[PDB]
Design a protein around this nucleic acid. Sequence first.
RNA 1: CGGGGAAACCCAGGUGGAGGCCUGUAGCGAUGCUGACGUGCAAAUCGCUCGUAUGAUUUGGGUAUCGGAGCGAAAGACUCA
RNA 2: ACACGAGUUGUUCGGAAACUGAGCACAACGUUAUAUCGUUUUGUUAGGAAAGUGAAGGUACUGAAAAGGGGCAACAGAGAACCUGGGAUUAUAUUCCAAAAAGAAAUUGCAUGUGGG
RNA 3: CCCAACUGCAGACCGUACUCAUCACCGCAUCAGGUCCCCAAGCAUAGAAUGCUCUGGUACAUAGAGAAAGGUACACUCAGGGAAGUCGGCAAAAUAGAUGCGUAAGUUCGCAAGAAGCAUUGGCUCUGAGGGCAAUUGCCAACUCAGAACUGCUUACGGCGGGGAAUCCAACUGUAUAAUUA
RNA 4: CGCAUGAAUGGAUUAAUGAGAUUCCCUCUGUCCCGAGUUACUAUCUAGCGAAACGACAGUCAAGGGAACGGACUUGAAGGGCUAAGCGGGGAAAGAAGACCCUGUUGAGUUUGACUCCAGUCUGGCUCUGUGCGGCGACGUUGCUUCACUUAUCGAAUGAAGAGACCAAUGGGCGUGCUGUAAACUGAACCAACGGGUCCGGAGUCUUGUUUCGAGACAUCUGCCAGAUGGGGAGUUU
RNA 5: GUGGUAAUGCGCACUUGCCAGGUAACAAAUCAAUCCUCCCACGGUGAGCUUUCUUUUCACCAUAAUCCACUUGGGCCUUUUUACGCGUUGUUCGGAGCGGGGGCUCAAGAUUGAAAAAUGCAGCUCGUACUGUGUGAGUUCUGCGCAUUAAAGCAAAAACCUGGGGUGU
Lengths: 252, 91, 50
Amino acid sequence: GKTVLSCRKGNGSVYQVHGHKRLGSAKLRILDYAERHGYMRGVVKSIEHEAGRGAALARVEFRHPYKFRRVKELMVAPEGMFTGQSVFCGQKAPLAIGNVLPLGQITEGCIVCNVEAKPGDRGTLARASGDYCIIISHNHETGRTRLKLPSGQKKSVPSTSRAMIGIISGGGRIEKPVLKAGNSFYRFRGKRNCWPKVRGVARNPVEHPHGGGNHQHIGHPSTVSRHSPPGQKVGLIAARRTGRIRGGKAVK
Amino acid sequence: AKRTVKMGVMGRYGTRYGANPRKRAKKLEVSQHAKHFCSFCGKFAFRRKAVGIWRCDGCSKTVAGGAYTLSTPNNSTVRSTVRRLRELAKI
Amino acid sequence: GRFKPLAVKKKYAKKMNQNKPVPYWIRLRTGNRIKWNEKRRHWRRTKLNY
RNA sequence: CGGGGAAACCCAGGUGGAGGCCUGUAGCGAUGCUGACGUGCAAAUCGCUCGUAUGAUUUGGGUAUCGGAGCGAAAGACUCA
RNA sequence: ACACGAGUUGUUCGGAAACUGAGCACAACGUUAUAUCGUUUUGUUAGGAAAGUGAAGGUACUGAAAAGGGGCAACAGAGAACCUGGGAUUAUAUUCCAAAAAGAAAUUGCAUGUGGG
RNA sequence: CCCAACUGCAGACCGUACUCAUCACCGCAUCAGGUCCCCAAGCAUAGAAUGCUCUGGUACAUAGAGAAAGGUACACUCAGGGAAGUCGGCAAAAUAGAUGCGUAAGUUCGCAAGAAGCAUUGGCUCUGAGGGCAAUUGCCAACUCAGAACUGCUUACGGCGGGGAAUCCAACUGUAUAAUUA
RNA sequence: CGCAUGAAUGGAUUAAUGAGAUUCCCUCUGUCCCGAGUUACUAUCUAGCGAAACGACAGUCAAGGGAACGGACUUGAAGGGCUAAGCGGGGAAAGAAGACCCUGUUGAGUUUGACUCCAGUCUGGCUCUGUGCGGCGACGUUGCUUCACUUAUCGAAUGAAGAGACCAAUGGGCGUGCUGUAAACUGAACCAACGGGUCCGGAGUCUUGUUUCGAGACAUCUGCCAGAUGGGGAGUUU
RNA sequence: GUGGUAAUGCGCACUUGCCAGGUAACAAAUCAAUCCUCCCACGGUGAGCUUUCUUUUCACCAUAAUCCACUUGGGCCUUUUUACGCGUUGUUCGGAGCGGGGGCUCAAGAUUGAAAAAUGCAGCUCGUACUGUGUGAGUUCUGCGCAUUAAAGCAAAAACCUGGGGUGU
């Protein structure tokens, strides 16, 4: 029959990021010679809001290390980062909220956000509003640093990786009930075409494996194998557990 | 006089969305429309702008504080621990 | 409308010239067939979409 | 602004103009008559009645995704009668 | 209707010359038995040598500086220097009017002249 | 060579008619369907509701005579009874504006609620209250509300909710089978 | 004592809300008893204009028999012709090669534990594929393999913007590139000043050579061969 | 280049070598409200009505671009010091400088002239000369944004602009 809707999102026709009103990507400053052997000092020129992001971004204005010009970097602001602040980024940079240190220089148990999982990555992780890592221990022989992240899993990043001290801006967002279909409207408007979402048992059998009839019901177990082909994987994909978690929630 | 017994800022949803979910939003709803102390100027001037952007009316400072309040509760520890954790390394 | 390409304007310029009736004398050519112009036109029917 | 109270706070009069809030135009729809029409005004229209009408609203131009495929607040809807 | 003549006038009005947007796909590269396929704006093509411009200086050489090819997409977004009067018509006009322009202005290019440098 | 105020000459290209709709487009047609934008008078009235009117525009929609039955209606009425009609109050009737008093159970305390229900309303001649400005005094505009006396009702345009007691289902606004199911 | 209720295949409630389903009550009424009068536009007659559906031929009945429900035949009863407006009993009236049902060695849409296979995903082997000391095995060689390597390859970033060394071996023929900061709270920086003999400094030099970082002979690398899964999809049957 | 304590005023140069910032550039509701429309007031010209009544009813009474020389609302300076005071219909503000005196600047106008009566309109005269020329209801231009509900925070670039630095030296 017809192709499932989870497969049609894979074309990217209507379902792409909207992202027009967005300001561009948010990254840490480039890793330079100064970044590695010293620190570069900028100043926070503003704090604003991407459409479709829950955090709060920052235009931080460094001076160009080489030519005569002034470069503006856009990074995800920590919690108490205020306009006019001076942000230090580099190896010599002191340990303070918003400064960016190489993650091997930071104490033992510090709170860290916006980590880069690869030394030059300009940060990929702990970037979502309110989220932070916890760096655990530095391994001085192998040159690694172990840290938990937000999902509870504990990873090991090469300690030349950089990091930004302090939790991410937004906080909450989630703790507040939406209350109406209406507030969910511009919710995703800045994000994607995710919504509203018809559940599978309602739609006809061509379109979905759940597409049954007399009584809305799946008719066959909803847990699906890992090796199931696209258009078949639907519902709970290789579930180890199912139903209420009564005690436990081991990190997934 | 006092024109509602309990509902408060949520009287704009007349009968509608249910008691407990309304009552739960009311907390976070009065928080963001509240004016928060500005440790820079000293006024209670901050107003929430966008999500997390807090602007002072006296200072004109903007802050990344976040959500429905200026400082989320686990920000205080993060700011206090690093004040400790920087100080401890200096010696 | 007021708008038009000039390339399109001419195509309607040509089609306005072609609507004239068949000359009276050209019926009198020896061995003549054409009587009335069979390609004539009226905007009310059969609209050029140029 | 006033009144009550030791306190905590509680009562009353104004101002203010909130809401996928109510009546009601245009707009957008299409409930009932199972009304007209039913070789029609019309290969789905008309009359009164009715839904909503600051919002998940209505709308022009441009632009993107289509044939075992597209798109779908899901009716086998729609993709030039 | 039909037949036979006539009618649409711009330095400023709309577009284009000359903006960018959702987007498009020429080059380039890669695929494909086959380009009639894909990539081609998250700052921007291409394993990728795509700058034909010229600061300062020496008299049409010498080489600082500039990373990321060409173009299209808006007659409702951006941009745009002109207004009324009329006896100027069968029909066009912020379009036409001629020395008292019915007249009054705005602006672009170049050029001489006087004033200054 | 640059600058300044004038002056001199030149200022190219394409559209420009008409139409935008009960006849100029799409719907085989001059089809009661559909189709974006701009300007928008007077009176009653809360008014872009609805009714009539000055400027503008129309008298084109095939007509004439004309009291049959049967019909259609963006048409009415009815003695006595008042849902007995019928699958079923379908259709019709009914309610109605504004102001004052009044208002139950249930409840997420927001509502329910215009709950239910009672009463007032014209015309005319007066009276009170509500302000501005100028130097207690002088001069002035534009309206609204309340009260009284006298007098009248044939209850009399348009427009405009019937209401109450409960059960089933979905929480709500929304969407949804273009052309039988909202 | 539930043919056959029941807990997110959600159970039980539920104010407000509904062009949703149902039942009573007040009000009101031509819904009704039981119908009557009036109006516009028709139908009606006229002027002008002027179609289509349909059409074997046709057209009054009773009974009989018949394909068992006649306009026609049989035996009877009616029947002068031509006409205008109505009406809806009949013409088993008109529309449409019954949609119901069965049949056909006709399909199509869906489903799965059908028959028959295909992509996708995983898995093994060889390959890509290199270097060094080793450890376990097999009969000097080879299978496997720990570890330390770096040039194939892979992942990332950058305008490929500063690597490594100099600190010198198992090489080849003190410190480590170092004005600045140590909670923060918005200033500026270019197109060399100058020194030395037009060059060299200022602004260290060198290159067995990667742009840099991470991984690295591994696998998510490449290609072929091999199995498992596989209504996601195909064909056909039932 | 040059004045003012200052907000900033006045008309030798070049700056797309370079850099930095602006304009372009976007935004609710309430209140006030521009052009303009309507209505009233004043009364000039013609017309309508006239048995009676009506100092009457109807129409018109206009000034384009361009360029010159008091009021309202905001930002600000100096001065005197304020911790109760100023202010809106309205959810405000001040020792990080309220209020008062005096000033600077910006926005929207008003006013007087150039254009411009030579035009337009109406009436009339024997195809001409003369005559005439509002504290009201609307109105989104504007005040008006770091500006709306907001888990909604409201395009970009040419082109232009000023400055930094420099050139002139």
